[PDB]
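Observation: inputs received (chain + zinc ion).
Thought: call the complex predictor directly.
Action: predict_structure
Action Input:
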Amino acid sequence: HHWGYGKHNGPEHWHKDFPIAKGERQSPVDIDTHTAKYDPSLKPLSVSYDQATSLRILNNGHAFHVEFDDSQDKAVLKGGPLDGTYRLIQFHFHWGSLDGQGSEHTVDKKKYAAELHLVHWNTKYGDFGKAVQQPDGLAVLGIFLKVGSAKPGLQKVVDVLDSIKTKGKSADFTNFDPRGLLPESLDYWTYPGSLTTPPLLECVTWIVLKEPISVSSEQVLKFRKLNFNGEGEPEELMVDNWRPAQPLKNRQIKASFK
Ligand SMILES: [Zn+2]
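Observation:
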């Protein structure tokens, strides 16, 4: 028995094993576009992924993750509301059983079909493990996905999902360029938050892009063919692996645009 997204181990149950689930800076949250404050002091985001080195893709039972080599400043995020350099370590998605749901963050209560999370850690802390224990340890770039035209740069990812259908499976995934998953504009909203999966640590500086990317119905459909279960067990489709919006509490969402 452990956490998941089912009726008996879902998000509503997480607080029993992870008390911080009821914390003061939990994520995701609903972004109220009319209450968000435009902050003129927010610097443009700086994304340097030209030297990114992907290593492997794996199904960990909660989602599928694409891991990168973070032993050097190959793929980093700077600028915006950030102080210092943050290295990309992995990216994963959150999707639904239907196109009308799937994203974790919502915009004026609107839900998207999926949400992409590019996770980076503050190099000042030496490694990911140390970074998660700090209030400014991580920086997660959130990108919304809507169903429409296919996204060419996502196809390499969808085609390998068949090889990691069940929990525990992993496969070599080299030379994948994450720049193909970025929207045209880098305008964003930012607020202090947490990881959206256990341990739910409050060490994240969220950067959510305003412009979503479009993916085809066929591409998202392949996401839905993955399994939460491990091989040799009753099949449970990996769908709706998203956490519902949490209380904003004493926090303000800032916008880089007006
Ligand atoms: Zn995530």
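Thought: report the result.
Final Answer: The chain is about 5% helix and 30% strand. The longest strand covers residues 86-95.
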